[PDB]
Amino acid sequence: GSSGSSGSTVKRKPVFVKVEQLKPGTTGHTLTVKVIEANIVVPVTRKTRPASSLSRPSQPSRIVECLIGDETGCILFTARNDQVDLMKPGATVILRNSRIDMFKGTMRLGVDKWGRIEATGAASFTVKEDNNLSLVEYESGPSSG
Numbered sequence: 001g002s003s004g005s006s007g008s009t010v011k012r013k014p015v016f017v018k019v020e021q022l023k024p025g026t027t028g029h030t031l032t033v034k035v036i037e038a039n040i041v042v043p044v045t046r047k048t049r050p051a052s053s054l055s056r057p058s059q060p061s062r063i064v065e066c067l068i069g070d071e072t073g074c075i076l077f078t079a080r081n082d083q084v085d086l087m088k089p090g091a092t093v094i095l096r097n098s099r100i101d102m103f104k105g106t107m108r109l110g111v112d113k114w115g116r117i118e119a120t121g122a123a124s125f126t127v128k129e130d131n132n133l134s135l136v137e138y139e140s141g142p143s144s145g
Contacts, residue, residue: 098111
């Protein structure tokens with residue numbers, strides 16, 4: 001007699017995800033990120049893309065880092081010469097099928113080839129330019145060396 005069975009599963013979440021709801025090892029996300037600032041990717045702090053590669057004439061992929069997120073938190077997301085437009089400062093856009101890149105003891109918001117920007121109307125929410133996720137570090141590890 002008897003069998004025994006358990007299971008509940010209570011995701012508990014809206015139709016869209018949140019910034020503070022992001023995590024490493026995750027992909028394809030759907031949330032509304034509001035751009036705050038948009039400035040070129042300065043050296044020293046945060047610098048990755050070329051990784052030893054300078055000689056052949058490539059295309060001008062104007063890349064600029066813009067601060068986007070929601071009331072929850074914010075994260076660093078790279079926007080191409082095209083996305084940049086959508087990722088303009090003071091503009092509200094959404095990320096569909098967005099993936100998270102596991103950065104050196106950190107992470108960031110990005111969109112894969114199987115993902116495109118939405119360009120929602122307006123945010124309507126006050127971004128929390130404090131609970132940055134592109135700053136906090138996950139799992140105590142190295143930094144540079």
